[PDB]
């Protein structure tokens, strides 16, 4: 819920900075060069 997220954020500069940092880390995590992650002897990864 975008409105709920914005309301939870409020207008704190520190809150905005922290949200930006967390968003950057998360956008780093999901999505990468490879397609299917092979983490383990049996690997299930989702290109779609």
């Amino acid at each position: 819920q975008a409105e709920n997220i914005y309301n939870r954020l409020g207008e704190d500069l520190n809150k905005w900075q922290a949200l930006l940092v967390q968003i950057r880390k998360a956008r780093g995590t999901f999505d990468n060069a490879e397609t299917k992650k092979e983490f383990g002897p049996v690997v299930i990864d989702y290109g779609k």
């Binding site: 956008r27 780093g28 999505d31 990468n32 060069a33």
Partner: peptide
């Protein structure tokens, strides 16, 4: 050998080979 390598880029002459190249894409950010 230098002439042959130049041609390959393009018997005592020789004929070397070539490797691959760094070609790819990303959307990281």
């Amino acid at each position: 050998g230098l002439r042959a390598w130049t041609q390959v880029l393009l018997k005592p002459g020789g004929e070397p080979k070539i490797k691959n190249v760094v070609h790819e894409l990303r959307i990281t950010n």
